[PDB]
Amino acid sequence: VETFAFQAEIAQLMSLIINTFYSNKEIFLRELISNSSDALDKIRYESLTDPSKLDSGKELHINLIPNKQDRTLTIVDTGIGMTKADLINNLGTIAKSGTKAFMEALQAGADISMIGQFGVGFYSAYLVAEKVTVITKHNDDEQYAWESSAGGSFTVRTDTGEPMGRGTKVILHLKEDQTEYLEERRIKEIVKKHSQFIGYPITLFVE
Numbered sequence: 460v461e462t463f464a465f466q467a468e469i470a471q472l473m474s475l476i477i478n479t480f481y482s483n484k485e486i487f488l489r490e491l492i493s494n495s496s497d498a499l500d501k502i503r504y505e506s507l508t509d510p511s512k513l514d515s516g517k518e519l520h521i522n523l524i525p526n527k528q529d530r531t532l533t534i535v536d537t538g539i540g541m542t543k544a545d546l547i548n549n550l551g552t553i554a555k556s557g558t559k560a561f562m563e564a565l566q567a568g569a570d571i572s573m574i575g576q577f578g579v580g581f582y583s584a585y586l587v588a589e590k591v592t593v594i595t596k597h598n599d600d601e602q603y604a605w606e607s608s609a610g611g612s613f614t615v616r617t618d619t620g621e622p623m624g625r626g627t628k629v630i631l632h633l634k635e636d637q638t639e640y641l642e643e644r645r646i647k648e649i650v651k652k653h654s655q656f657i658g659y660p661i662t663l664f665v666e
């Protein structure tokens with residue numbers, strides 16, 4: 460288990476998302492589904508040129524898994540997955556320009572729902588989650604667990620839990636007052652409103 464500091468701009472973004480009063484929290488779901496869809500687009504493209512890239516699973520889709528016992532909502536995809544370098548370095552580095560632009564837009568009248576237009580929608584997870592755990596497996600790399608409760612740091616470890624094949628699971632440990640997002644009716648509503656045209660099956664698990 461290694462502990463890393465977020466780059467200052469990302470820690471700043473995370474604090475803004477946690478601290479700002481903003482009632483329209485439900486858009487976190489569209490942001491994460493969109494991330495999943497992008498990752499599924501990547502493996503679909505790559506597998507078209509190299510069919511063996513689907514040896515780790517042919518099916519391209521999204522699962523939404525609420526668990527009231529654990530108070531978690533898990534977004535699972537069989538997209539391309541992330542490498543250790545992505546989790547530790549690449550994605551945070553790239554996110555710096557998007558963060559800065561988002562923060563400037565918010566000063567000029569944008570609102571937190573527009574976060575995806577700056578390519579940093581993953582962090583919208585913190586609108587609703589006290590802790591986010593990401594399990595991810597990319598072809599030719601090992602399975603990793605990334606985790607953060609914000610506060611300026613995150614961890615990465617090699618994951619020795621159940622193997623997942625290929626893709627990403629974002630496990631949202633929901634804030635105590637955000638359990639509405641475990642409700643079937645509420646999730647279906649939000650998917651219908653903001654994620655209506657995703658080009659992959661989205662299966663909402665029931666409890």
Ligand SMILES: Nc1nc2c3ccc(S(N)(=O)=O)cc3nc(Cc3ccc4c(c3)OCO4)n2n1
Nearest residue numbers: 494495498539540541542545550581593605627
């Ligand atoms: N679900 C999902 N999948 C990805 C993803 C997949 C591949 C690639 S890659 N190798 O082409 O650069 C990037 C991906 N990025 C995201 C979004 C994201 C951003 C930051 C994260 C994160 C996910 O998990 C922890 O920190 N996500 N989110």
